[PDB]
């Protein structure tokens, strides 16, 4: 809409700063290249439980004028046991041709599963579902018409096999 | 070192090469050795080298290949070893062992 | 995993080793850097002052402290286990030796009377030891100048040029790259501050540093001019400005 | 793309690049190649990234993994790992390995009065076994990373296992400090009144990771100032950012 | 460790000096070995307290020639090898000063 | 990982046990007690006059507020304010008030706050050597107007650390205050503060623990001390009514 309402309470510098973290790479990002730097392919939003952040990220991408979509990481592994990662790539292609757009996805600590806890060939779903995530987000080129958000409570429980170094580069706690 | 060798080929090869002798000498064949000393002396060398000049086959188990994380997956695995020896008899086994630590 | 031969002191482990001492010597290595090296005609004793807040007057408390006029000290590690130590160290000069020999003691017999004040607290449970260390340094007139270390175990390794604390081996690596046999004090003094410019962060001025010397008598500190033989102290703490020029000579 | 770090680079080109594309060198002389190395020295120092470049020239495969993963609670769920990777690091040969931490699971111990820590030996003794026992020769696998080297087992340092210690700066290497700034700066566009020589000596301790935490905080606020180009004054507010004394979280309550 | 399972056992000790000399000739059979060598001496200049540290030595010697691009060596290229495996084992982990008599 | 091997493997209930990190933890757990009141004092210097301020809360109405106070006149020329529970403040207050005395019986003059912070802190060390006594869960401030040093503030914690600040605060809310006078001093570069009168220096220190504290204060929610040569005492309530009229 580019003029949407977001006036719930609790937090101001966050909504103030994500506006800095995320607005400029989307609206006129032809400058991040010639200046020299590479912008952040991704984001992570961690904190304690029971805080109402699902609506937050839903909101601030709505005032800015970005096409927002959101899917938990449950049904993709609850409804779809071993036919999951097909949904991932479709969730981006659909997202691509509707560029620009934002992602949001909670319960992200479910992709781990075993996290190769034993390397047996029975958890291929719990393994590959991380793979197709990473290969796809690397495919963006980080131009400025698609960005990504993730969240959970236990970032110490996270899977830094990826999503630590340069993918979910900016980590942001919350009060 | 070569004296060390002479005990190996006394126990290993003689009961295999021609053991009619012991029936004359009136004693029991032997059935194993063990070799100790610090690292960096060339003991795991030798068992690589004994293979070249056997005429009988060879089996090797570094420790920690036995363990398989279930209750009896290990003790089924040792037994799956020896039967694979007898049919392929004769045979030699070589082992770094710390499963028998403690 | 734990060890069950470390929560107490009077227990030996199969390697014939004791529990808590090994960790006290780690309580100091986590502490700040302090040192003292030696020369032909004097001894130097140095450290810094990592002032916590800006509002703490870093002058109302001295890392260095006088034990006798000819003997001074410095720690590295914990603090309160220093000013509780010295207050019962300098006494022992005035109690065990002085009053029955007239004069202040040598430098090593002082150490023996420290290190058992250090070892009284590592022989019975109900006592943590002194999580500190020390570098006693002084002079006397049959064995000469000296330097000495004192660990919490009660052992006193002697030394020539040494440091302790976190920034130790970086410094000890550096001393013999610069140390000699025939060195003189005012040559051995700018060494012992350019040793400390590496093991530091931020400001490096007289108000973030303090050190000492040993030398020939400083009778102007004495107070009672009129005796021919009572040559006064042999220990003087260098003021700020007396340091704060040498750096600009460097 | 890396900064400077000249001779450290020179030594792994000897240990790693040559044995993969050049072998008659080591043959005719009358010797065998050295096996892997380790890279000791404080963190945020370009250890891991160097090793990545090494792959990028030599084109060989690459396996990155961390030492806190070999440890596992189910008995034998660790040494299955250390043996599993080699089963494939041969397969996709020529191949090498990097381990961003091994001091964790590697440290001398006088004995084990415990069940858990005994398995840590069963981990290691298989690792030490795979290289030294019979195997292939194109793997140069082990590149042990750490933060110190005064802790490992000398039985790991038995020549044949590891024979090329390697060291990196910690601080006060002003030369290696200034040398990277131009490199990162060589990537970015700056105005001529944008001198960095004010920055180096002003410090007394930092590393090579922070500088990127500075540059990507230096050339981040220009755009906040909606300029196509950067200036100097943006910088000075950064060096305080990636500086010391963020907060005395538990600095005083520790010992005293 | 009973008989009936292991009927004898072996001690592999580390070698003498005249012992080690043959350990080098086998590792050096493929090196070039310039003339004026007395490798009965190099053993004595440094007892390889192992019997495999030498295997790094005879390797390490040639590594100098690689750096220089020379193919062969002499006695000198050994006499420094001892400086690494032996001294740098004493200058490796003897770096404490705190100890108890 | 920080206290995980602490809370499990002992190291948190005996005083005299080190951890392999070197840290002993019991005394490092004492400080959580200092903030069990949600209270926040202050102290500053003068030309010759010193001041210390404290809140004095508004609990249930049944109290007799004349006696609720964390300001203890120790001797003359000396005073102190605590940060922690009341009972573990008395035993420090009283072990002192019978310590300045014997000095004056044994050395011929009154102790300064130098020694009085070095003595009482030379004790809280000891009680972290032996198991005589749990270390008193406080952190206490001293004040004085000495003859040889002028004004002087000092401070003491359950380990034994003591330094004579130039100005300071304490409690749950140090960062907010401490900045609202750290920045003040770098303006003027005066360890002390101007405004000769012990009156006019109060109103300086009040207003800084209003703007940076977080609310507005009456006369009853406070209690305030002061040190001047020959004396130490407490105060009345009008000093703020003669502030906001001027503003
Ligand atoms: N006499 C020798 N001849 C040739 N090589 C030797 C000799 N002695 C030692 N070595 C060298 O020592 C190494 C083998 O060491 P050794 O086999 O004794 O350790 P290990 O037995 O593998 O230890 P563990 O079995 O406990 O893992 C080889 O690299 C080998 O070149
Ligand atoms: N800052 C807030 N403002 C309004 N409601 C909130 C806030 N924080 C939490 N909530 C309440 O909590 C619920 C949302 O929390 P939830 O989205 O489950 O948090 P999380 O996504 O971290 O699990 C809603 O019912 C909402 O009313
Ligand atoms: N000399 C250098 N040149 C370029 N980048 C450097 C340099 N030193 C450090 N870095 C930066 O440090 C980061 C990697 O640090 P790393 O080597 O992973 O630390 P560690 O070795 O402790 O894992 C990279 O982002 C890289 O840009």
From Swiss-Prot, chain A:
ATP binds at residues 47-54. N-acetylated by NAT1. The 26S proteasome is involved in the ATP-dependent degradation of ubiquitinated proteins. The regulatory (or ATPase) complex confers ATP dependency and substrate specificity to the 26S complex. Belongs to the AAA ATPase family. This is 26S proteasome subunit RPT4. It comes from Saccharomyces cerevisiae (strain ATCC 204508 / S288c) (Baker's yeast). The gene is RPT4.
UniProtKB/Swiss-Prot annotation, chain C:
There is a cross-link at residue 108 (Glycyl lysine isopeptide (Lys-Gly) (interchain with G-Cter in ubiquitin)). GO terms for biological process: proteasomal ubiquitin-independent protein catabolic process; proteasome-mediated ubiquitin-dependent protein catabolic process. SUPFAM superfamilies: N-terminal nucleophile aminohydrolases (Ntn hydrolases). Pfam families: Proteasome (PF00227), Proteasome_A_N (PF10584). Gene3D superfamilies: Glutamine Phosphoribosylpyrophosphate, subunit 1, domain 1. InterPro entries: Ntn_hydrolases_N, Proteasome_alpha, Proteasome_alpha-type, Proteasome_asu_N, Proteasome_sua/b. CDD domains: proteasome_alpha_type_2. It comes from the Eukaryota. GO terms for cellular component: nucleus; proteasome complex; proteasome core complex, alpha-subunit complex; proteasome storage granule. Keywords: Cytoplasm, Isopeptide bond, Nucleus, Proteasome, Ubl conjugation. Its main location: cytoplasm. It is found in: Cytoplasm; Nucleus. Signal peptide: none annotated. PANTHER family: PROTEASOME SUBUNIT ALPHA/BETA. The proteasome degrades poly-ubiquitinated proteins in the cytoplasm and in the nucleus. It is essential for the regulated turnover of proteins and for the removal of misfolded proteins. The proteasome is a multicatalytic proteinase complex that is characterized by its ability to cleave peptides with Arg, Phe, Tyr, Leu, and Glu adjacent to the leaving group at neutral or slightly basic pH. It has an ATP-dependent proteolytic activity. Belongs to the peptidase T1A family. Present with 7060 molecules/cell in log phase SD medium. This is Proteasome subunit alpha type-2.
UniProtKB/Swiss-Prot annotation, chain D:
Keywords: Acetylation, ATP-binding, Cytoplasm, Isopeptide bond, Nucleotide-binding, Nucleus, Proteasome, Ubl conjugation. The keyword Magnesium does not apply. GO terms for biological process: positive regulation of RNA polymerase II transcription preinitiation complex assembly; proteasome regulatory particle assembly; proteasome-mediated ubiquitin-dependent protein catabolic process; ubiquitin-dependent protein catabolic process. It is found in: Cytoplasm; Nucleus. N-acetylated by NAT3. Transmembrane segments: none annotated. ATP binds at residues 41-48. One of its GO terms (cellular component) is nucleus. There is a cross-link at residue 108 (Glycyl lysine isopeptide (Lys-Gly) (interchain with G-Cter in ubiquitin)). GO terms for molecular function: ATP binding; ATP hydrolysis activity; identical protein binding; proteasome-activating activity. Its main location: cytoplasm. It comes from the Eukaryota. Belongs to the AAA ATPase family. The 26S proteasome is involved in the ATP-dependent degradation of ubiquitinated proteins. The regulatory (or ATPase) complex confers ATP dependency and substrate specificity to the 26S complex. This is 26S proteasome regulatory subunit 6B homolog. The lineage of its organism: Eukaryota, Fungi, Dikarya, Ascomycota, Saccharomycotina. The chain holds residues 173 to 428 of 428 of the full protein.
Swiss-Prot record, chain E:
It is found in: Cytoplasm; Nucleus. Disulfide bonds: none annotated. Signal peptide: none annotated. Coiled coil: none annotated. N-acetylated by NAT1. May form a homodimer or a heterodimer with a related family member. Interacts with OLA1, TMA17, and UBR1. The 26S proteasome is involved in the ATP-dependent degradation of ubiquitinated proteins. The regulatory (or ATPase) complex confers ATP dependency and substrate specificity to the 26S complex. Present with 4700 molecules/cell in log phase SD medium. Belongs to the AAA ATPase family. This is 26S proteasome regulatory subunit 8 homolog. It comes from Saccharomyces cerevisiae (strain ATCC 204508 / S288c) (Baker's yeast). The chain holds residues 305 to 405 of 405 of the full protein.
């Amino acid at each position: 809409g580019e003029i949407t309402f977001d006036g719930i309470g609790g937090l101001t510098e966050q909504i103030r700063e994500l506006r800095e973290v995320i607005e400029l790479p989307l609206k006129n990002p032809e400058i991040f290249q010639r200046v020299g730097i590479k912008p952040p392919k991704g984001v992570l939003l961690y904190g304690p439980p029971g805080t109402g952040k699902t609506l937050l990220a839903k909101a601030v991408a709505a005032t800015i004028g970005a096409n927002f979509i959101f899917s938990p990481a449950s049904g993709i592994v609850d409804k779809y046991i071993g036919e999951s990662a097909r949904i991932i790539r479709e969730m981006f292609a659909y997202a691509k041709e509707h560029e620009p757009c934002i992602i949001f996805m909670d319960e992200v600590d479910a992709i781990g599963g075993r996290r190769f806890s034993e390397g047996t060939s029975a958890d291929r779903e719990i393994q590959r579902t991380l793979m197709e995530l990473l290969t796809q987000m690397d495919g963006f080129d980080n131009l400025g018409q698609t960005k990504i958000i993730m969240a959970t409570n236990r970032p110490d429980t996270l899977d830094p096999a990826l999503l630590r170094p340069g993918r979910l580069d900016r980590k942001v706690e919350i009060p | 070192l070569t004296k060390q060798i002479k005990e190996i080929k006394e126990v290993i090869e003689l009961p295999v090469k021609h053991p009619e002798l012991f029936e004359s000498l009136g004693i029991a064949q032997p059935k194993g050795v063990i070799l100790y000393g610090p690292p960096g002396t060339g003991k795991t060398l030798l068992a690589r080298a004994v293979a070249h000049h056997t005429d009988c086959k060879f089996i090797r188990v570094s420790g920690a290949e036995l363990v398989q994380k279930y209750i009896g997956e290990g003790s089924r695995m040792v037994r799956e070893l020896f039967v694979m020896a007898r049919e392929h008899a004769p045979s030699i086994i070589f082992m770094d062992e710390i499963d028998s630590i403690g | 995993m734990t060890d069950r031969y470390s929560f107490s002191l009077t227990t030996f482990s199969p390697s014939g080793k004791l529990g808590q001492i090994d960790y006290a010597l780690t309580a100091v290595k986590q502490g700040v850097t302090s040192l003292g090296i030696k020369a032909t005609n004097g001894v130097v004793i140095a450290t810094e002052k990592k002032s916590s807040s800006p509002l703490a007057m870093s002058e109302t408390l001295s890392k260095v402290s006088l034990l006798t006029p000819d003997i001074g000290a410095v720690y590295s590690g914990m603090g309160p286990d220093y000013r509780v130590l010295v207050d019962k160290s300098r006494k022992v000069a005035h109690t065990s030796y002085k009053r029955i020999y007239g004069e202040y003691p040598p430098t090593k017999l002082l150490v023996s009377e420290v290190a058992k004040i250090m070892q009284e607290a590592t022989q019975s449970g109900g006592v943590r030891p002194f999580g500190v260390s020390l570098l006693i340094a002084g002079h006397d007139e049959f064995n000469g100048f000296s330097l000495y270390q004192v660990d919490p175990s009660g052992s006193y390794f002697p030394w020539k040029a040494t440091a302790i604390g976190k920034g130790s081996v970086a410094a000890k690596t550096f001393l013999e790259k610069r140390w000699n046999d025939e060195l003189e004090l005012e040559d051995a003094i700018h060494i012992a501050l350019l040793t400390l410019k590496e093991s530091v962060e931020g400001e490096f001025n007289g108000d973030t540093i303090e050190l000492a010397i040993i030398g020939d008598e400083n009778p102007d500190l004495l107070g009672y001019t009129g005796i021919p033989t009572d040559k006064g102290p042999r220990f003087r703490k260098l003021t700020s400005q007396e340091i704060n020029d040498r750096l600009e000579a460097l | 793309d890396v900064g400077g770090l000249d001779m450290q680079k020179q030594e792994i080109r000897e240990a790693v690049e040559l044995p993969l594309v050049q072998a008659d060198l080591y043959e005719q002389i009358g010797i065998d190649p050295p096996r892997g190395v380790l890279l000791y020295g404080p963190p945020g120092t370009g250890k891991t990234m160097l090793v990545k470049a090494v792959a990028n020239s030599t084109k060989a495969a690459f396996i990155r993994v961390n030492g806190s993963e070999f440890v596992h609670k189910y008995l034998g769920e660790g040494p299955r790992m250390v043996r599993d990777v080699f089963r494939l690091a041969r397969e996709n040969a020529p191949s090498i390995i990097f381990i961003d931490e091994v001091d964790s699971i590697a440290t001398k111990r006088f004995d084990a009065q415990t069940g858990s820590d005994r398995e840590v030996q069963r981990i290691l003794i298989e690792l030490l076994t795979q290289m030294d026992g019979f195997d292939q020769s194109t793997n140069v696998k082990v590149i042990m990373a750490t933060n110190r080297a005064d802790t490992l087992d000398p039985a790991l340092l038995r020549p044949g296992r590891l024979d090329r210690k390697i060291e990196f700066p910690s601080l006060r290497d002003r030369r290696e400090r200034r040398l990277i700034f131009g490199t990162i700066a060589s990537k970015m566009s700056l105005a001529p009144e944008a001198d960095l020589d004010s920055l180096i000596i002003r410090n007394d301790s930092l590393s090579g990771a922070v500088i990127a935490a500075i540059m990507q905080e230096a050339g981040l606020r220009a755009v906040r100032k909606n300029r196509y180009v950067i200036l100097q004054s943006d910088l000075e507010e950064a060096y305080a950012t990636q500086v010391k004394t963020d907060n005395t979280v538990d600095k005083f309550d520790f010992y005293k | 460790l009973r008989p009936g399972r292991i009927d004898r056992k072996i001690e592999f000790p580390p070698p003498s000096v005249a012992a080690r000399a043959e350990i080098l000739r086998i590792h050096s059979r493929k090196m070039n070995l310039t003339r004026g060598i007395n490798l009965r001496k190099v053993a004595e200049k440094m007892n390889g307290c192992s019997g495999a540290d030498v295997k790094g030595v005879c390797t390490e010697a040639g590594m100098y020639a690689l750096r220089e691009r020379r193919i062969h060596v002499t006695q000198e290229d050994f006499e420094l090898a001892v400086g690494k495996v032996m001294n740098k084992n004493q200058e490796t982990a003897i770096s404490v000063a705190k100890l108890f008599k | 990982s920080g206290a995980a091997a602490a809370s499990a493997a002992g190291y948190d209930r005996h005083i005299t046990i080190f951890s392999p990190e070197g840290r002993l933890y019991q005394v490092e757990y004492a400080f959580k007690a200092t903030n069990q009141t949600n209270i926040n004092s202050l102290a500053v210097r003068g030309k010759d006059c010193t001041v210390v301020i404290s809140q004095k809360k508004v609990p249930d109405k049944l109290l007799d507020p004349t006696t609720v106070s964390y300001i203890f006149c120790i001797s003359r020329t000396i005073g102190m304010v605590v940060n922690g529970p009341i009972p573990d403040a008395r035993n420090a207050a009283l072990r002192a008030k019978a310590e300045a005395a014997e000095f004056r019986y044994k050395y011929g003059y009154d102790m300064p706050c130098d020694v009085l912070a070095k003595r009482m802190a030379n004790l809280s060390q000891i009680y972290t050597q032996r198991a005589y006594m749990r270390p008193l869960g406080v952190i206490l401030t001293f004040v004085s107007v000495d003859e040889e040093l002028g004004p002087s503030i000092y401070k003491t914690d359950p380990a034994g650390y003591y330094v004579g600040y130039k100005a300071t605060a304490t409690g749950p809310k140090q960062q907010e205050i401490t900045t609202n006078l750290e920045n003040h001093f770098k303006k003027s570069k005066i360890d002390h503060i101007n405004e000769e009168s012990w009156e006019k220096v109060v109103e300086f220190a009040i207003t800084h623990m209003i703007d940076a504290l977080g609310t507005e204060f009456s006369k009853n929610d406070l209690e305030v001390g002061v040190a001047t040569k020959d004396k130490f005492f407490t105060l009345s309530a009008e000093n703020i009514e003669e502030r906001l009229v001027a503003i």
